[PDB]
Design goal:
part of a larger assembly, 9 chains, A: 135 residues, 57% helix, extended, binds phosphatidylethanolamine, binds NADPH dihydro-nicotinamide-adenine-dinucleotide phosphate, binds iron/sulfur cluster, 4Fe4S_Fe-S-bd (chain D), ubiquinone (chain D), 4Fe4S_Fe_S_CS (chain D), translocase (chain D), metal ion binding (chain D)
Chain lengths: 135, 150, 363, 199, 216, 62, 383, 90, 119
């Protein structure tokens, strides 16, 4: 990106970059770390147990959390987790906290409680260039 | 040269002498209309050359050393009621910088039905009016059927 | 002719884009009553031709009143020239005269406006053959045996109009109230803006004022009814009042707590108004001169101006006239009271009004 | 410069924040505290004695002594192109016959419905209009009618100076549009000799 | 609050391969399998984000619009944070003639989605003011234009039409020019509404070919 | 009063797409209203009307 | 004490505002709109697709061709129409000229509302130059109707790129002399710094887009994330600030003018030779010489200018990075030659909804600054 | 510092109605002058919508979805931004 | 006991409470009284006395509410009340048993070829 300030800013220092884009003032003044991401993801893994075992929602949340924790485990520096998960760690901790917050509302609504012969029609679109252009 | 200035002033105003110029009603309106005053006294007497004259009497000047879009100007012959609707269409595209053609360098094709340019008639009672108007010679009732008259 | 005027060419339900079939010429169309008449005709889909003498700025408000092509404007009218009158009426089957005068000038006298022009207008109207209706306006107090010159010249011109055009209708309304009138406006300019307001004698002469919209409706009702051709109608409101009652009503409405009027004998009022009446000629006419500062007004104040017994009035036209003392007619004079019109405290009734309304009005 | 100061802050929450906490010293867009005497004198000569107003004043004084961009209408005109969409006009062949053949394509394409057409056959068998109206107060001056015409009969000419005093003067019928074409024919042909290479 | 400026270099890429593949191919099946009771119908079509892809459309009941939108906002794989608009489409041939349409954008993974609810004229739709703050004015406009009532709204009032305007103009049975028109009256000294009269009535051109195959 | 009807094929052409033959594919049934008064504009001759339902059934309701 | 709010009516003369104050501090702002609502969404159902195109010029009438772009792209996606290369380059070039025009007007009208009168008069002569560029290719200074389905309406006249290069050679100097009056001035800073702050969470929750979104530290440009026409080939930067200030939005808008100049320079050097319109004759009308010489071209000219093309049944939403944010069209097709439903999404509608939460804690003389920095035009707000 | 207001012939030297070189604008591709068949390029009418089999008893394996995702900074693969929209050769 | 929760009479009571502030703000003190205004608003309510659906009742009450705040906030002036509320009522109760023996058909016949549209 281009910085509109006429002064020279380093931006290799990651704390300066987090200050300049307003992460400190507007999202989280406390710096997010790898341990806080691990704690938040384990909070999600504890919170999802209110969903039934056979539900696809629980499997989806658990698989996402397990992949995130494996990324956290195999990478020690927080810049590596930033480069893998394509965000700032403050964003990722907020994502995990929001995912943990979501669980009681979904569990109260119970979307998994459909009949056994539940049916959803789907209509898909095929482009003309599939049959007109070269295979 | 001030002699050049006065010769330019006399050829632009169309008068015969400085005494005839300063004692005219055209100079009287140039004391109260500053747009005409600037056009006659400053622009037409400056650097530039005369290009041509239309049939309404307006003179056309140009200056290639000026800024773009201020290279061409007109001196209207009607000093008291000057109007851009008296510019003929063969000078209109030259003066509006649409093309570089005028009668002095281009022979236009003249249709046999061509109506010459004259001043607008709006605000008077000889303006254009539709055929259903009160000002027409015979107003139209636009009925699409014929009534039975016994 | 009879009721073929209002039925034969009527196209559309009667709005701005419809056609009524009436082509009308209104003389004095930029005036007080003429503007309301021109609005009444044009809104129903009639073509209205308006000649005028004044500048175009004072006639521009008539341009709005009708659809495209239906308001015709003819400036530089000279009523001493028959060519202008002939051109203005050359397509009209209705002519309405609202030309009148209140003060004399070195260029125009009462006979020139109330006598000579109505006679020549009636003659030129009868010459065309296509004019089916001529509506001439005069006053309720018009009389040939009147000491006031304008009433006498008006009655003489009424006689000349009924002579030259035998089916012309003569309309004689009382005092007309309105936003731009010449009746309450000059009375309010007399109650305020002066050290004292003279009242002629005891102020016990009776009048019958009427509303301007009722007169405008009366013209259309006359054009509907064929029997009203050649007749004379008196237009007056539902209440008969004296001038003292009118002054008391204006002083109560204006909320003025000091009666500045003084009752004076008629010779004293005429002695006051005499120096500015012997100099009324050799002068082109001055602004802000009251039409009440003349001896003719003093002579009018010594007589009753009411509807005569057995005369044709509003009821024969099917019109119930609106009250003049209260309602919409008195609302313009309520705007000139001390301090302003205003609502009030507005808190007794805002008790059970909803939430955002009180905060919106800051109550 | 785009630098910030504690005190030049336009609001109150940030003014209260800068005078009770040193969080503004972490932000890189702020100007730092002067460290020695000369820096204090530079900061005071910035705040007192202005010198930021003076740069704008020097620029506007330079503009006072510079050249001007005003044209003296109506003795001088602006600049337009042969594609310019002005007053509508109806055209003829060089013989003097109308080009229009009442196909009603320009009436169909008109998004404003500003065109009204009636036609019948002429006494020599030709297909010609009897009514061709353009409501210029309904027109949007798009030029779609010029594009739809297959015989180049309706054009938008190079005229833009046609303001009137009554609105009835702007409801053009067929005769006035032919009169406009007869007025502007040579200019329209000169414009179309260039624009036919592109269209 | 996402898509913070992180890379200081110029980026020549959009998304990652695995997440773009998931969003462009598997998102319909994912949403159907995780929350099946919320979804009643799905269409995967020509992709709001770009001409080169496909993107899903989800049909839901009004009873579960709010939980589905909360799930689509807060779930870690579907982070649809921005609600771009709320509108309606009128289908007078149907028993429930209105389709309320919600468009969403995910700044986290460069995605878009569309959510539909079918109701008639007298069935309320739950408001999304608590989920998305822009839902206020869009629901006000939808009520103004179509007459769809949004229950639980803080202040459902008209926003676009005239002050005394009754009637919902974007319905198919509402006339293009309306019922009333406006002019100044010299007698009443007020701007007055009157029944409609036109100097030139609107000309309807019926162009449609009797050989055309595409009309549905 | 309204009329519910499906318009017949035009005599000038042979195609059947705007008929009740393709009724399940394409909406073909219409709602139409009786005409109200029309007249000519005195200034130009354009056709004037006061009907608000002049084109709403023939353009929009299928 | 129990202080009631003092309310104020702010202007019939087309924004109407009903404020509430607790002294000199605003507690509430309620915009009343619809004074320019002309019902263009209803009128588009009664037009063919070519007939309804000039409605879009009159939505954001400071930025016309960008409004045309999204409607054209929405039609082209359902039609499955490809645009040739030269037409894509022309569309990108004139979209960036449009963005420069809009940002000139927005910054100088804002600075005139604050009180600085000279930058307005300096920038409008540059606006006149870009209007001459519009007129030389379309014949209209503002409502060009230039972008069409499948390409552009006419080719570029010979001599246009020469003059666009001559303008772009001095535009940076004009932007430089513009910033000498405003950027390092204490009165402008004291009016604009920390006024109406927008954080990222509030920006996404309130549907923000455009230069508002970039001044709150969000890297989101539709020309780089979801590119359209030849914007993926263009090399430019996204300016980023991090306070959410009026001052930061002003700086972001100036830098966006610089980047638009960069894209304009790149388009002037890579303009290819070839077709500017799609060669599908059943969508794009033929040339005027072809129409006067072949029967199929005349038939297609007759039918495309009366009935128009039939768009296949379906729906789409297509968006463009308009100079005020994201401008989008939701087109619903039943299969006819007329749109069944055409919803128009405007960014200024969403930006004006925020005035209740942005003006809280501000004073009366900062309302006009907030309205000016949101960059609102009521044609697109009131459709 | 570049000056506003260029002088004579330094800007718009020729008016657009007096272009010094005649323009030859292509309006058709050379590939389509003599090869005019349309059904091989009818992209408008060849798109399809197909009703999928009813998405009920499908097998969404999340293990495969998360098994194709990277775990290290290198081995992250990014989709490059498309340079142009499809032109189909024109 | 009262159909659909008695919401019609509750809304009527709310409007009747709101009415004297309308009369003061719109300056209708000498034009209509509160008794005849209450009777007129009551006559607006009886036109939908045969609605069999509660959701239609709720929508009608919501729309009538929005009408009453657009009258409260001076977004429609006194001439709007005249031309929309009280003169239609006085026309519906003034033409009853007219002074002429003409049927409604014959008045319609003499007026125009078609029925009147609107008011
Ligand atoms: C011809 C017309 C001439 C005027 C043209 C320019 C108009 C400018 C108007 C705005 C001026 C702003 C202004 O005065 O700002 C103040 C500083 O300047 C001043 O106070 C300036 C006035 C005083 C001049 C300097 C006085 C001290 C000089 C040295 C004295 C000691 C040595 C000699 C004995 C305070 O702004 P701030 O930011 O400082 O406010 C501190 C808290 N925020
Ligand atoms: N209460 C009332 O006002 C009453 C009025 N009438 C009569 O009804 C008519 C209403 O006139 P009103 O409008 O009330 O008052 P106005 O004075 O406003 O009517 C004057 C009109 O007559 C025109 N006029 C006067 N003298 C001449 C002239 N010499 N040549 C041409 N035009 C002339 C005026 O034109 P300009 O504006 O150029 O002078 C103006 O249009 C008058 O005849 C009046 O006597 C009857 C009873 C009472
Ligand atoms: S230019 Fe446009 S508005 Fe004017 S007549 Fe042609 S199509 Fe109609
Ligand atoms: S002007 Fe051209 S398009 Fe219009 S009717 Fe005549 S020939 Fe047809």
């Amino acid at each position: 990106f281009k910085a509109v300030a006429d002064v020279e800013i380093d931006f290799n220092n990651r704390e300066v970059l987090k200050k300049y884009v307003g992460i400190r003032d507007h999202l989280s003044k406390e710096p997010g770390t790898r341990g806080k991401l691990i704690e938040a993801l384990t909070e999600v893994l504890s919170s999802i147990k209110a969903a039934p075992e056979g539900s696809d929602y629980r499997k989806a949340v658990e698989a996402s959390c397990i992949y995130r924790l494996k990324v956290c485990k195999e990478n020690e520096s927080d810049a590596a987790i930033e480069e893998v998960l394509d965000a700032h760690l403050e964003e990722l901790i907020k994502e995990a906290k929001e995912e943990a917050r979501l669980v009681p509302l979904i569990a109260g609504n119970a979307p998994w409680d459909v009949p056994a012969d539940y049916a959803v029609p789907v209509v898909d679109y095929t482009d003309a260039a599939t049959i007109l252009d070269a295979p | 040269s001030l002699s050049g200035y006065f010769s330019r002033l006399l050829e632009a105003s169309g008068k015969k002498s400085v005494g005839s110029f300063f004692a005219s009603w055209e100079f009287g309106k140039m004391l109260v209309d500053g747009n005409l005053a600037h056009n006659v006294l400053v622009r037409a007497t400056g650097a530039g050359r005369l290009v041509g004259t239309d049939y309404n009497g307006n003179r056309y000047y140009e200056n290639e050393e000026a800024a773009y879009g201020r290279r061409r100007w007109i001196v209207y012959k009607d000093k008291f009621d000057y109007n851009p609707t008296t510019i003929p269409p063969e000078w209109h595209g030259w003066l509006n910088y649409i093309n570089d053609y005028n009668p002095t360098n281009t022979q236009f094709k003249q249709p046999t039905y061509q109506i010459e340019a004259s001043m607008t008639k709006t605000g008077t009672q000889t303006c254009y009016n539709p055929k259903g108007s009160w000002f027409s010679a015979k107003p139209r009732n636009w009925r699409k059927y014929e009534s039975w008259t016994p | 002719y009879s009721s073929t005027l209002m039925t034969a060419d009527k196209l559309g339900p009667g709005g701005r884009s419809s056609v009524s079939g009436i082509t009308a010429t209104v003389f004095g169309a930029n005036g007080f009553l003429g503007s309301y008449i021109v609005n009444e005709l044009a809104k129903r889909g009639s073509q209205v031709v308006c000649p005028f003498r004044s500048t175009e700025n004072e006639a521009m408000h008539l341009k709005q009143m009708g659809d495209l092509g239906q308001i015709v404007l003819l400036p530089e009218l000279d009523i001493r020239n028959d060519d202008d009158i002939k051109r203005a009426i050359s397509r009209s089957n209705v002519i309405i005269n609202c030309v009148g005068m209140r003060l004399q000038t070195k260029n125009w006298s009462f006979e020139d406006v109330h006598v000579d022009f109505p006679k020549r207008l009636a003659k030129l109207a009868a010459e065309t053959g296509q004019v089916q209706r001529l509506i001439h306006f005069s006053d309720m107090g018009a009389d040939e045996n009147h000491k006031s010159l304008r009433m006498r010249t008006k009655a003489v011109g009424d006689k000349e109009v009924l002579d030259a055009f035998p089916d012309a209708t003569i309309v004689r309304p009382g005092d007309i109230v309105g936003i731009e009138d010449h009746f309450y406006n000059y009375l309010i300019y007399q109650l305020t803006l002066t050290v004292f307001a003279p009242v002629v004698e005891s102020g016990s002469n009776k009048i019958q004022p009427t509303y301007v919209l009722d007169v405008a409706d009366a013209v259309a009702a006359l054009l509907r009814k064929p029997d009203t051709a050649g007749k004379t109608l008196y237009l007056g409101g539902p209440e008969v009042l004296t001038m003292r009652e009118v002054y008391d009503l204006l002083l109560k409405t204006l909320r003025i707590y000091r009666d500045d009027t003084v009752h004076l004998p008629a010779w004293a009022v005429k002695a006051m108004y005499k120096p500015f009446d012997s100099v009324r000629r050799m002068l082109p006419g001055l602004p802000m001169t009251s039409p009440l500062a003349t001896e003719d007004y003093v002579e009018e104040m010594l007589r009753d101006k009411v509807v005569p017994a057995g005369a044709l009035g509003y009821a024969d036209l099917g019109i119930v006239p609106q009250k003049v003392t209260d309602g919409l007619a008195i609302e313009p004079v309520r705007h000139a009271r001390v301090g302003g019109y205003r609502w009030g405290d507005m808190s007794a009734v805002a008790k059970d009004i909803p939430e955002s309304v009180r905060k919106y009005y800051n109550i | 410069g785009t630098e910030r100061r504690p005190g030049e802050s336009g609001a109150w929450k940030q003014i209260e924040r800068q005078r009770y906490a040193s969080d503004w010293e972490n932000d890189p867009t702020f100007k730092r505290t002067p460290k020695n005497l000369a820096e204090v004198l530079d900061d005071s000569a910035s705040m007192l004695l202005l010198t930021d107003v003076w740069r704008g004043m020097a620029y506007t004084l330079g503009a006072f002594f510079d050249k001007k961009v005003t044209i003296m209408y109506p003795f001088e005109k602006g600049q337009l192109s042969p594609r310019f969409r002005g007053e509508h006009a109806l055209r003829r062949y060089p013989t003097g016959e109308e080009r229009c053949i009442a196909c009603k394509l320009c009436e169909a394409i008109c998004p404003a419905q500003a065109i009204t057409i009636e036609a019948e056959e002429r006494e020599d068998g030709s297909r010609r209009t009897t009514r061709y109206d353009i409501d210029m107060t309904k027109c949007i001056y798009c030029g779609f009618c010029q594009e739809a015409c297959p015989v180049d009969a309706i054009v938008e000419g190079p005229n833009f100076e046609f303001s009137t005093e009554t609105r009835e003067e702007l409801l053009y019928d067929k005769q006035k549009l032919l009169e406009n074409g007869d007025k502007w024919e040579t200019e329209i042909a000169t414009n179309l000799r260039t624009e036919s290479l592109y269209r | 609050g996402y898509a913070y400026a992180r890379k200081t270099t110029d980026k020549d890429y959009i998304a990652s391969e695995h997440m773009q593949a998931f969003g462009n191919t598997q998102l319909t099946d994912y949403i159907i399998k995780t929350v099946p009771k919320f979804v009643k119908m799905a269409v995967t079509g020509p992709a709001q984000s770009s001409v080169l892809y496909q993107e899903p459309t989800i049909y839901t009941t009004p009873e579960s619009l709010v939980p589905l939108m909360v799930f689509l906002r807060d779930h870690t794989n579907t982070q649809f944070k921005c609600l771009l608009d709320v509108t309606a489409v009128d289908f007078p041939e149907r028993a429930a003639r209105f389709e309320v349409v919600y468009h969403l954008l995910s700044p986290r993974w460069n995605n878009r989605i569309r959510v539909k609810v079918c109701v008639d004229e007298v069935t309320a739709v739950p408001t999304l003011c608590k989920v998305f703050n822009t839902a206020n004015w869009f629901e006000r406009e939808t009520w103004d234009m179509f007459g769809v009532f949004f229950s639980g709204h803080p202040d459902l009032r008209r926003i676009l039409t005239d002050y005394g305007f009754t009637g919902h103009p974007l319905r198919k049975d509402f006339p293009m020019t309306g019922y009333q028109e406006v002019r100044y009256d010299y007698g009443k000294k007020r701007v007055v509404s009157e029944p409609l009269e036109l100097t030139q009535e609107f000309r309807y051109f019926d162009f449609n070919s009797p050989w055309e195959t595409l009309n549905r | 009063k309204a009329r519910i009807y499906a318009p017949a094929r035009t005599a000038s052409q042979s195609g059947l797409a705007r008929t009740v033959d393709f009724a399940t594919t394409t909406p073909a049934w219409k709602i139409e209203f009786e005409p109200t008064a029309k007249w000519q504009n005195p200034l130009m001759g354009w056709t004037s009307s006061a009907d608000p339902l002049e084109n709403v059934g023939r353009s929009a309701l299928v | 004490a129990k202080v009631n709010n003092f309310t104020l009516n702010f202007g019939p003369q087309v924004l109407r505002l009903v404020l509430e104050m607790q002294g000199e501090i605003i507690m509430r702002a309620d915009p009343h709109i619809g004074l320019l609502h002309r019902g263009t969404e209803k009128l588009l159902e009664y037009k063919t697709y070519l007939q309804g195109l000039p409605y879009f010029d009159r939505l954001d009438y400071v930025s016309m061709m960008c409004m045309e772009h999204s409607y054209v792209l929405a039609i082209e996606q359902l039609l499955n129409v490809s645009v040739p290369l030269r037409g894509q380059y022309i569309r990108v070039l004139f979209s960036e000229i449009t963005r420069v025009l809009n940002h000139l007007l927005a910054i100088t009208c804002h600075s005139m509302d604050v009180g600085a009168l000279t930058p307005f008069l300096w920038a409008f002569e540059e606006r006149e130059k870009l209007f001459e560029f519009y007129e030389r290719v379309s014949g209209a200074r503002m409502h060009a109707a230039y972008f069409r389905v499948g390409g552009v309406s006419q080719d570029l006249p010979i001599g246009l790129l020469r003059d666009v290069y001559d303008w772009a050679r001095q535009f940076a100097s004009r932007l430089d002399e513009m910033e000498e009056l405003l950027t390092g001035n204490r009165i402008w800073k004291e009016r604009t710094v920390d006024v109406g702050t927008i954080t990222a969470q509030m920006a996404w929750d309130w549907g923000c887009s455009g230069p508002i979104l970039r001044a709150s530290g969000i890297d989101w440009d539709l020309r780089k994330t979801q590119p359209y026409d030849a914007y993926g080939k263009m090399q430019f930067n996204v300016p980023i600030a991090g306070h959410g200030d009026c001052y930061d939005r002003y700086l972001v808008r100036l830098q966006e003018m610089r980047e638009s100049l960069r894209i304009i320079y790149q388009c002037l050097n890579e303009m290819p030779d070839g077709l500017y319109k799609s060669p599908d004759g059943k969508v794009c009308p033929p040339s005027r010489s072809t129409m006067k010489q072949s029967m199929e071209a005349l038939i297609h000219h007759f039918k495309l200018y009366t009935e128009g093309f039939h768009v296949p049944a379906g729906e789409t939403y297509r968006a463009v990075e308009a100079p005020k944010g994201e401008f989008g069209v939701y087109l619903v097709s039943r299969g006819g030659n007329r749109p069944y439903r055409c919803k128009i999404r405007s960014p200024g509608y969403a930006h004006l909804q925020m005035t209740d939460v942005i003006s809280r804690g501000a004073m009366l003389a900062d309302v006009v600054t907030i309205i000016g920095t949101l960059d609102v035009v009521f044609g697109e707000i009131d459709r | 510092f570049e000056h506003y207001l260029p002088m004579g012939l330094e800007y718009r030297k020729f008016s657009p109605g007096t272009q010094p070189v005649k323009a030859v604008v292509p309006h058709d591709s050379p590939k389509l002058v003599y090869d005019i068949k349309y059904f091989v390029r009818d992209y408008r009418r060849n798109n399809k919508y197909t009703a999928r089999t009813v998405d009920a008893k499908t097998t969404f394996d999340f293990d495969k979805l998360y098994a194709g995702m990277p775990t290290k900074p290198e081995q992250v693969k990014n989709v490059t931004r498309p340079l142009i929209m499809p032109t189909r050769g024109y | 006991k009262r159909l659909f929760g008695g919401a019609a009479r509750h809304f009527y009571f709310e409007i009747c409470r709101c009415l004297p502030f309308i009369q003061r703000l719109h300056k209708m003190e000498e034009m209509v009284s509160l008794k005849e205004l209450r009777a007129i608003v009551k006559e607006k309510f009886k036109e939908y006395k045969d609605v069999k659906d509660g959701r239609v009742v709720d929508l009608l009450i919501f729309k009538g509410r929005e009408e009453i705040e657009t009258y409260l906030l001076m977004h429609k002036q006194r001439h709007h009340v005249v031309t929309e509320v009280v003169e239609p009522y006085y026309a519906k109760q003034r033409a009853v048993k007219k002074v002429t023996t003409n049927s409604p058909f014959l008045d319609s016949f003499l007026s125009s070829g078609y029925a009147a549209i609107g008011v």
